[PDB]
Design a protein around this ligand. Structure first.
Ligand SMILES: CC(=O)O[C@H]1C(=O)[C@@]2(C)[C@H]([C@H](OC(=O)c3ccccc3)[C@]3(O)C[C@H](OC(=O)[C@H](O)[C@@H](NC(=O)c4ccccc4)c4ccccc4)C(C)=C1C3(C)C)[C@]1(OC(C)=O)CO[C@@H]1C[C@@H]2O
Ligand SMILES: Nc1nc2c(ncn2[C@@H]2O[C@H](COP(=O)(O)OP(=O)(O)OP(=O)(O)O)[C@@H](O)[C@H]2O)c(=O)[nH]1
Ligand SMILES: Nc1nc2c(ncn2[C@@H]2O[C@H](COP(=O)(O)OP(=O)(O)O)[C@@H](O)[C@H]2O)c(=O)[nH]1
Ligand SMILES: Nc1ncnc2c1ncn2[C@@H]1O[C@H](COP(=O)(O)OP(=O)(O)O)[C@@H](O)[C@H]1O
Ligand SMILES: [Mg+2]
Lengths: 441, 434, 345
């Protein structure tokens, strides 16, 4: 069968995985103890879904995941929680000390002494998999682990596994909000190394999801346990065709193709429009047109950027539930008739479309509502260059004075890596501005 | 396995420790016999950060007392929480420093430092991994100034990979408590500036004004002042012990609070602080705490941030909160008070949250800040100093114990250079065009 | 006031390189230096106050040794007699021509011998029987923020590298205790001391080369011009003094490629911290020359702390960076040219 390994690196990664696997365990029918109750019915069957869960002969389903944090505080909440009996006990802590929000530590100093032990486990899982396709990585630009250790691991896996998809789901840094002073450095240092190895990096931001949870869901005091539940739905919509049946199916190599024109502009966004409450589950039809128009509103983007300030280059639209393609065609016609939604001249073929039949599942204690139809929109837009223009400027301020640099040098780095990375990002800005130019011979 | 070694040196240090080990032992469920009598199960997970285990499931703190007079030893032993410390760790001598940085750094401290290092090595080598060290010490006197700084210099040489925190009680502007505060403080700064990573400056007068204006206490003893210091101590080390949504440690805070290695002198503070009667008429929410913490009348350093610019601040929250209400609030401060912050650092605030608060409050918070206002703390000393040094006032009691006049000028110049380094970043000027 | 003079010297291809036929990456247009990646995607330009082209003789503007001495070093010997201090930096990675520009071979002498010989042959001319010049030399190193002296002969034991310490005299400024100063009369005595010191300097056979310079090295010369009072009273009266320093720094040592653990890693950390602080100091000095009051962080390293009076106020600093134009050392050349680049304004 088909298999996809998930690599949740850092606090953000683990706290997203603890919801993603909470969701997968319900979509398929797995209890937290790993024991499916309704394996009564199989008589064969394939509902022990091999894309995420490996089955063993005792009637148990163990996930294809790896945890690593450089600190036990988060992983040890899994060992002590409700899903302690599911995961293989190789939930790799190495937390004698953490990265201290330093890329210098999570790359060489403490990033090594681990990576052998992570690769030995990834090798053990891959060999347990026949037709493996993809590496779903989960991390955060802004910390040291997610920044440096992920860079190292993606450097290694590009040598050990070669030409296999590597999709990063990353917490992008926000313009105004920040829980750290050294995200502008780590973000650039991670982009410089991951850009040559990754193949499509789906970005999110906490500020946008706060705005969504306020406006739509009516949550004025939201926390991470609301945001990660939505990110889990994004990943499930990405990983639905490999599990459930549909009319238009989508493999992982299709995102790597339909959304990456050039090998450095592989930084798209994410969107999930039906984030309405159970109250507003009524008072709304929730048709394909309403959703498809919501996904193109700059307010319901999961990344804080106005695509009116740029141009769309490609857009995948993954739908779940009672959808008919006539509705999608009508919706896309409405969207193409609109003038605020501009495209590049060299991409007249626009949208990738995908349909799956199984609708989303509601978690108890969640804020979403049971809706018959769901949508996930992942778009590549030049407007994100403006975000890169912000991060590159902050860098220029607190690097002219060489602030916080001695901490990085003190853990195995050089004053030149910063310049290298800044020049690569300045090159990427020009690469984002070039494609926006209209074609003339 | 992020283990801390507490070193207590002098009356101030031991009297703060005797309150801090009452605060942590309460936060973890230990009694004066050293035994767990708690309710939860998170108290036992990371108890290794301060305590070590023994035969009968007893928990002995990793403390090292240093004081050079037996009076504080007996106060600790003849006390509430005295029979949990190890007797082989009550290191002490006789004939104290005499409010002299020289007697406690060359003459009497050199005759005892080996005995402290022999315990430090024992307690550090029994640790799986070590995060750093922890010293509470009053500069202004002797022992805490000299025999503290020497221990710092000898640990930093033995461990030039670990954190060395110093929770110091600096002298006050108006009223002194020792005539030779300037010399000793200057000679301690010359050793801390070069051998520390994050040093937290406390002042008796700021804490008296807190006790009078916020807590409405009329006659506050030092057990009340140290009750505020212990609160901040626990605030710094909550992420390592307890869990949280967004965690931190000493290394991460030091990374995100020290642009340059010399400017590691910070203003501590704690919320929510209130009088017993004015509790029923307040609301326990995040904005009230943020208003209490960034208030100049809630500092411990006796230096107003209105006369300077914050370079980098931290906020360790404890309780079930929402990260949106921290991000919004800490963005509001940067915007409404842009002049009190730096421009070449876009976001000056770090946030950390822990899901387990203090025993009596639904929510808590701890505030560290690196400001150019602590300039005023040193510029005063250098003014008190040089006058005396212009006359050689009280110096024959330090030269006699094996010191030279050069060691004073060196420290004075280092302090004044630190002043210049902090003052370079408090006059907001613009660029060519931008 | 004090501005700095950063220069670059491209070494020519080794005969091993053009026999193996390594490709060329560093180009020049007289004024600017340019680096063109073998992929030919990105081209980076670097401007400097002076640029030395030692790639091939037949080129116009060939940069021999005699035009490096006359261009950088000699105006510092000239400022010495005026009574001011001077420092000469020497940055460069292994296999780039640091010891060819500074010390040189038996023929083709670098800056040290030319400098010293011109100094001696000029005091021989200027001395009047009423003026007298006395020179005093020193030679020390920096290893993990520890000062070591080299000219003292070390008998074999664990090691007699005593960690000397620095102090701050109120007038004379920062200095070094235990510094074995020595007297000099002509250049043939400096060769002996420097050989005896370089033999005891720290080295390690790391991955890049069989011997790398894992330590800094400061070579100081202090001159004193005594001219006589006969108002009525003979001299011991008037000692205008000047410190001329030649420092031979180490390499940056990126540890991504070099899987360095332990002592080599600690040495790399110390070197890179020192170089960062030195860059900060040079940038602050250039800003000060350009009319901005700033704070020069001297006290963040020993190298910047001891040379404070030699790169401050009435002082003239010079810096030379060495580069290889080969395509196997592009990542080193880039960082070198970018380390030098933040000193030019
Ligand atoms: C019914 C009730 O709410 O009583 C509160 C109380 O009234 C107030 C005033 C408490 C009270 O604290 C003080 O009045 C005080 C006295 C001297 C110096 C400093 C404070 C309180 O005594 C203090 C005590 O705080 C704690 O218990 C924390 O655990 C504290 N540790 C200790 O107090 C402690 C002392 C000795 C031995 C063991 C533990 C702590 C704080 C931070 C980090 C770790 C621990 C609390 C909530 C209260 C009383 C009891 C009235 C306050 O204390 C703190 C640190 O938050 C004072 O202002 C807050 C607001 C509280 O409402
Ligand atoms: N969406 C979301 N973001 C998170 C979560 N936890 C942390 N973050 C973000 O992660 C960023 C910092 O990266 P961290 O994950 O804390 O760093 P780390 O991976 O733990 O690595 P260390 O610094 O060594 O601890 C912050 O900007 C947070 O906003 C989470 O649970 N959900
Ligand atoms: N905050 C606080 N400060 C104290 C306390 N006791 C003493 N101090 C301060 O610390 C100094 C005491 O110096 P000390 O080291 O005890 O002198 P020594 O006995 O010779 O070592 C004085 O300047 C006091 O201001 C205390 O309990 N709390
Ligand atoms: N301008 C030049 N002309 C000719 N040869 C040069 C020039 N510069 C450097 N070289 C050659 O390059 C080598 C430099 O080695 P060296 O600089 O001593 O190594 P390191 O930089 O590790 O000290 C010498 O052998 C020398 O022959
Ligand atoms: Mg973490």
């Amino acid at each position: 069968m088909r298999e996809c390994i998930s690599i949740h690196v850092g606090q953000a990664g683990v706290q997203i995985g603890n919801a993603c696997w909470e969701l997968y365990c319900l979509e398929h029918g797995i209890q937290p103890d790993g024991q499916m109750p309704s394996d009564k019915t199989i008589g064969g069957g394939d509902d022990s879904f091999n894309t995420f869960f490996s089955e063993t002969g005792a009637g148990k389903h163990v996930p294809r995941a790896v945890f690593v944090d450089l600190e036990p505080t988060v992983i040890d909440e899994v060992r002590t929680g409700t899903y302690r009996q599911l995961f293989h006990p190789e939930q790799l802590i190495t937390g004698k000390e953490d990265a201290a929000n330093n890329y210098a530590r999570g790359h060489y100093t403490i990033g090594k002494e681990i990576i052998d032990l992570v690769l030995d486990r990834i090798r053990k899982l891959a060999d347990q998999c026949t037709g493996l396709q993809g590496f779903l990585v989960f991390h955060s630009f802004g910390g040291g682990t997610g920044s440096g250790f992920t860079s190292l691991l993606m450097e290694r896996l590009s040598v050990d596994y070669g030409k296999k998809s590597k999709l990063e789901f990353s917490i992008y840094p926000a313009p105004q909000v920040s829980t750290a002073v050294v995200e502008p450095y780590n973000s650039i240092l991670t982009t410089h190394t991951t850009l040559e190895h990754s193949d499509c990096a789906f970005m999110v931001d906490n500020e946008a999801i706060y705005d969504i949870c306020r406006r739509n869901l009516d949550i004025e005091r939201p926390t991470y346990t609301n945001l990660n539940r939505l990110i889990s739905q994004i990943v499930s919509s990405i990983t639905a065709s490999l599990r459930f049946d549909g009319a238009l199916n989508v493999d992982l190599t299709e995102f790597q193709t339909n959304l990456v024109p050039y090998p450095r502009i592989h930084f798209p966004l994410a969107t999930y429009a039906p984030v309405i409450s159970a109250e507003k589950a009524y008072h709304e039809q929730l048709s394909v047109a309403e959703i498809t128009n919501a996904c193109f509103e700059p307010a319901n983007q999961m990344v804080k950027c106005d695509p009116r300030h740029g141009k769309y280059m490609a857009c995948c639209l993954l739908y779940r539930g009672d959808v008919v393609p006539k509705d999608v065609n009508a919706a896309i016609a409405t969207i193409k008739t609109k003038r605020s939604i501009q495209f590049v001249d060299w991409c007249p073929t626009g949208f990738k479309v995908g349909i799956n039949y199984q609708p989303p599942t509601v978690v108890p204690g969640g804020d979403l509502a049971k809706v018959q139809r769901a949508v996930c929109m992942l778009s590549n837009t030049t407007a994100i260059a403006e975000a890169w223009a912000r991060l590159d400027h902050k860098f220029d301020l607190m690097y002219a004075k060489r602030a916080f640099v001695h901490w990085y040098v003190g853990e195995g780095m050089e004053e030149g890596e910063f310049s290298e990375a800044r020049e690569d990002m300045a090159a990427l800005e020009k690469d984002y501005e070039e494609v926006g130019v209209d074609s003339v011979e | 396995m992020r283990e801390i070694v507490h070193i207590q040196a002098g009356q101030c240090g031991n009297q703060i420790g005797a309150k801090f080990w009452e605060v942590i032992s309460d936060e973890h469920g230990i009694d004066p016999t050293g035994s767990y009598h708690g309710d939860s199960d998170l108290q036992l997970e990371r108890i290794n950060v301060y305590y070590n285990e023994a035969t009968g499931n007893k928990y002995v703190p990793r403390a090292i007392l240093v004081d050079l007079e037996p009076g504080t030893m007996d106060s600790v032993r003849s006390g509430p929480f005295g029979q949990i410390f190890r007797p082989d760790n009550f290191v002490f001598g006789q004939s104290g420093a005499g409010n002299n940085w020289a007697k406690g750094h060359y003459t009497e401290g050199a005759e005892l430092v080996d005995s402290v290092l022999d315990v430090v090595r024992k307690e550090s080598e029994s640790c799986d991994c070590l995060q750093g060290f922890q010293l509470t010490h009053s500069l202004g006197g002797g022992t805490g100034s000299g025999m503290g700084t020497l221990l710092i210099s000898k640990i930093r040489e033995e461990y030039p990979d670990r954190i060395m925190n110093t929770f110091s009680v600096m002298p006050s502007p108006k009223v002194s408590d020792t005539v030779v505060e300037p010399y000793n403080a200057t000679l301690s700064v010359h050793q801390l500036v070069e051998n520390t990573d994050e040093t937290y400056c406390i002042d008796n007068e700021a804490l008296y004004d807190i006790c009078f204006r916020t807590l409405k206490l009329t006659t506050p003893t030092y057990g009340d002042l140290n009750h505020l210091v212990s609160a901040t101590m626990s605030g710094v080390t909550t992420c390592l012990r307890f869990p949280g949504q967004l965690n931190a440690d000493l290394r991460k805070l030091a990374v995100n609070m020290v642009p340059f290695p010399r400017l590691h002198f910070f203003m501590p503070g704690f919320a929510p602080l209130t009088s017993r009667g004015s509790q029923q008429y307040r609301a326990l929410t995040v904005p009230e705490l943020t208003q209490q913490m960034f208030d100049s009348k809630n500092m411990m350093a006796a230096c107003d941030p209105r006369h300077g610019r914050y370079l980098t601040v931290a906020a360790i929250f404890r309780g079930r909160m929402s990260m949106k209400e921290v991000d919004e609030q800490m963005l509001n401060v940067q915007n409404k008070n842009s002049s009190y912050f730096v421009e070449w650092i876009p976001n000056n605030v770090k946030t950390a949250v822990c899901d387990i608060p203090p025993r009596g409050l639904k929510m808590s918070a701890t505030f560290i800040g690196n400001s150019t206002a602590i300039q005023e703390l040193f510029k005063r000393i250098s003014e008190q100093f040089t006058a005396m040094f212009r006359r050689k006032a009280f110096l024959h009691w330090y030269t006699g114990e094996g010191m030279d006049e050069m060691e004073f000028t060196e420290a004075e110049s280092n302090m004044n250079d630190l002043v210049s380094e902090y003052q370079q970043y408090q006059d907001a000027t613009a660029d060519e065009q931008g | 006031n004090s501005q700095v003079t950063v220069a670059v010297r491209v070494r020519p291809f080794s005969k091993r390189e053009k026999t193996e036929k390594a490709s060329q990456v560093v180009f020049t247009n007289g004024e600017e230096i340019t680096v063109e990646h073998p992929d030919m995607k990105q081209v980076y330009s670097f401007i400097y106050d002076v640029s030395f082209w030692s790639f091939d003789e037949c080129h116009p503007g060939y940069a021999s040794q005699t035009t490096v001495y006359e261009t950088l070093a000699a105006p510092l010997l000239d400022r010495a007699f005026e009574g001011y201090n001077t420092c000469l930096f020497a940055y460069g990675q292994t296999g780039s021509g640091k010891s060819y520009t500074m010390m040189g071979l038996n023929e083709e002498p670098g800056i040290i011998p030319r400098f010293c010989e011109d100094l001696f042959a000029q005091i021989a001319k200027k001395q009047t029987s009423e003026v007298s010049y006395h020179l005093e030399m020193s030679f020390f190193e920096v290893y993990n923020e520890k000062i070591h002296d080299l000219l003292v002969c070390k008998g074999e034991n664990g090691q007699r590298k005593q960690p000397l310490r620095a102090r701050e005299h109120p007038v004379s400024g920062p200095y070094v205790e235990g510094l074995s100063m020595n007297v000099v009369s002509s250049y043939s005595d400096i060769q002996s001391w420097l050989e005896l010191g370089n033999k005891q300097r720290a080295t390690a056979a790391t991955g890049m080369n069989d011997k790398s310079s894992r330590s800094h090295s400061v070579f100081t010369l202090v001159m004193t011009q005594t001219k006589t009072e006969v108002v009525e009273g003979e001299e011991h009266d008037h000692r205008i003094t000047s410190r001329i320093n030649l420092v031979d720094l180490a390499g940056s040592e990126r540890c991504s490629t070099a899987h360095s653990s332990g002592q080599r890693l600690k040495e790399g950390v110390s070197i890179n911290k020192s170089l960062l602080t030195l860059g900060k100091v040079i940038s602050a000095l250039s800003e000060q020359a350009n009319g901005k009051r700033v704070f020069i962080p001297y006290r963040e390293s020993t190298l910047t702390w001891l040379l404070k009076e030699s790169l401050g106020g009435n002082s003239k600093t010079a810096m030379i960076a060495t580069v290889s134009p080969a395509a196997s050392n592009i990542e080193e050349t880039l960082s070198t040219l970018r380390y030098a680049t933040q000193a030019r304004l």
